[PDB]
Write a protein that binds this ligand. Structure first.
Ligand code: HEM
Lengths: 90, 135
């Protein structure tokens, strides 16, 4: 528990980040396996670069939450990619 | 696309989209870095001679979305029709068409830090995934 403000925050994000992934459909044009990663990659680099404003506390623990966020997003990100790389061969 | 998804995007673009047309030049550049393969060719905008054509296209995109969005309800192909024009008559790979709108989004993120909420990104993201014809 790096704090509390950054606990309901890190959780709200992992939420909104889920609606993003779940609302995703694999219609044409289908983007190459590689390019897709870059997008999700660019999506995270978005959230973090965004919440890195909502986070509070001291720039010591402030940059700990974020580092934990990026860690967590990937938790939901990986299933998605596997889900897509599966659509490729499919 | 749900009627909720329609009220969302309608507003999502209201906040975040006033200057979308000035970020023309940028996003194209951002699409060349994030997706290096989108640059190997790219016969458009006569880039080597200046950001004139590409900055203008920026506006053409932002105006296109402003309108297509303001008409999600009644003109659902507004965008799909556009994609077709590019792919069939302007000889522009629909992959590029898609990515460039992605970068426009990422580019907006960079300029509107706190106003560009993840929610707003989602609303828009959805709308942009409305590229196939509806009947
Ligand atoms: C978010 C995606 C995009 C939107 C909404 C969009 C929208 C537009 C619009 C509204 C026009 C004017 C069409 C007309 O004459 O009626 C246009 C023109 C054009 N677009 Fe796009 N575009 C997009 C992506 C792209 C991409 C990725 C390329 C390049 C590979 C491209 C290349 C062109 C070219 C070459 C023209 C003709 C410009 C001119 O009149 O000089 N567009 N686009």
């Amino acid at each position: 528990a790096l704090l509390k403000a950054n606990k309901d925050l890190i959780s709200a994000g992992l939420k909104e980040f889920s609606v993003l992934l779940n609302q995703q459909v694999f219609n044409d044009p289908l983007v190459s396996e590689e390019d897709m990663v870059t997008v999700v990659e660019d999506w995270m680099n978005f959230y973090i670069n965004y919440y890195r404003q909502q986070v509070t506390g001291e720039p010591q623990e402030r940059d700990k939450a974020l580092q934990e966020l990026r860690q967590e997003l990937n938790t939901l990100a990986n299933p998605f990619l596997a889900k897509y790389r599966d659509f490729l061969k499919s | 696309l749900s009627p909720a998804d329609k009220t969302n995007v309608k507003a999502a673009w209201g906040k975040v989209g006033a200057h979308a047309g000035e970020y023309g030049a940028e996003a194209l550049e951002r699409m060349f870095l994030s997706f290096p393969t989108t640059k190997t060719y790219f016969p458009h905008f006569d880039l080597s001679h200046g950001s004139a054509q590409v900055k203008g296209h920026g506006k053409k995109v932002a105006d296109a979305l402003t309108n297509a969005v303001a008409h999600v309800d009644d003109m659902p192909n507004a965008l799909s029709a556009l994609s077709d024009l590019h792919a069939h008559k302007l000889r522009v790979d629909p992959v590029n068409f898609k990515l460039l709108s992605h970068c426009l989004l990422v580019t907006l993120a960079a300029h509107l830090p706190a106003e560009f909420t993840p929610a707003v990104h989602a609303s828009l993201d959805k709308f942009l995934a409305s590229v196939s014809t509806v009947l």
